[PDB]
Design a protein around this ligand. Structure first.
Ligand code: HPA
Ligand SMILES: [Zn+2]
Length: 313
């Protein structure tokens, strides 16, 4: 663990909203004078049992209620950056879901201000390079995403890319082809969630329609040999999230996970925590799980860590 924790890493698949520790949620609710449904930290913490992606999302979005002021968004981001320092993550390219907040009345400028301020401290104080990624909510309409992109334009230099998260199944990448087209035209790089719960086809769509630079999750690509051969050949990065896949039942067990298999075949896989506050582990806890349940070696450890550095945008 300590050896794993000492490795220099880059986290390329992480939702800032998914770093909302139960404790923080309660503290922010207190500061905002919000009455929580949950009786105590422990009660919220045991609500963290998921049968699938959606059950997690429902709670995930619920917690986002406490995020209301700039200082809120700073605290959220700064807390995570401190974890990064602790676990020697030297570079971050995090997600956030502006719609989750803007649809709640919180000004776009307020959300960005808080996060940006934290990112600034992260680099000058902690020496952590950042690349903010704006993610669209895929269960919502492409029109709603277009309206979000319009908000983002004056801010565009604050984002290295646009992403796509939320309920995958039934909301294929193609649904957002237009806004992604416009995003790139406006100077955004692109990434996307594909093949978490969705089929290999969704991954092809991400690659060819949304023209992403990397696939987020992408584990279901294992079902498609033709796709696998492309991945290996094009060295397109995959931001794999071990604990997330386990907690969401993508794999019935960590021993079932295919990330090492992919690694040995030549796929540019990386290790990420995704939604750490919800899956009970940050990036180091993810590396560790691979070691305990898959007998991962230091050898493959150095390699995964390196890929994450290489796959920086
Ligand atoms: O990992 C994820 N998958 C889909 N939607 C999400 N919203 C936060 N994390 C995720
Ligand atoms: Zn994710």
């Amino acid at each position: 663990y300590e050896w794993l924790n000492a490795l220099p890493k880059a986290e390329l698949h992480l939702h800032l909203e998914g770093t909302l520790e139960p404790e923080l949620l309660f503290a922010l609710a207190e500061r905002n004078r919000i009455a929580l449904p949950w009786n105590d930290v422990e009660t919220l913490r045991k609500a963290y049992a998921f049968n699938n992606l959606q059950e997690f999302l429902d709670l995930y979005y619920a917690g986002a209620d406490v995020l209301r002021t700039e200082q809120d968004f700073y605290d959220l981001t700064w807390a995570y950056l401190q974890k990064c320092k602790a676990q020697n993550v030297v570079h971050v390219e995090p997600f956030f879901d502006p719609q989750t907040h803007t649809d709640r009345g919180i000004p776009f400028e307020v959300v960005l201000a808080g996060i940006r301020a934290a990112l600034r401290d992260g680099e000058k104080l902690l020496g952590i390079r950042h690349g903010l990624i704006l993610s669209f909510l895929r269960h919502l309409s492409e029109e709603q995403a277009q309206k979000t992109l319009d908000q983002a334009l004056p801010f565009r230099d604050a984002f290295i890319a646009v992403g796509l998260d939320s309920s995958e199944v039934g909301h294929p990448p193609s649904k957002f082809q237009r806004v992604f087209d416009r995003a790139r035209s406006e100077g955004f790089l692109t990434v996307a969630h594909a093949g978490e719960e969705g089929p290999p086809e969704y991954i092809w769509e991400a690659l060819d329609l949304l023209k992403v630079e990397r696939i987020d999750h992408g584990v279901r690509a294992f079902e498609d040999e033709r796709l696998m051969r492309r991945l290996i050949d094009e060295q397109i990065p995959l931001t794999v999230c071990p604990l997330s896949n386990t907690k969401l039942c993508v794999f019935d067990d960590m021993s079932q996970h295919t990330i090492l298999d992919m690694l040995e075949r030549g796929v540019k896989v990386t290790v990420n925590s995704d939604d750490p506050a919800y899956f009970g582990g940050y990036v180091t806890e993810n590396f560790h799980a691979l070691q305990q349940s898959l007998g991962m070696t230091e050898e493959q450890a150095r390699r995964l860590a390196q890929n994450s550095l290489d796959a920086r945008l």
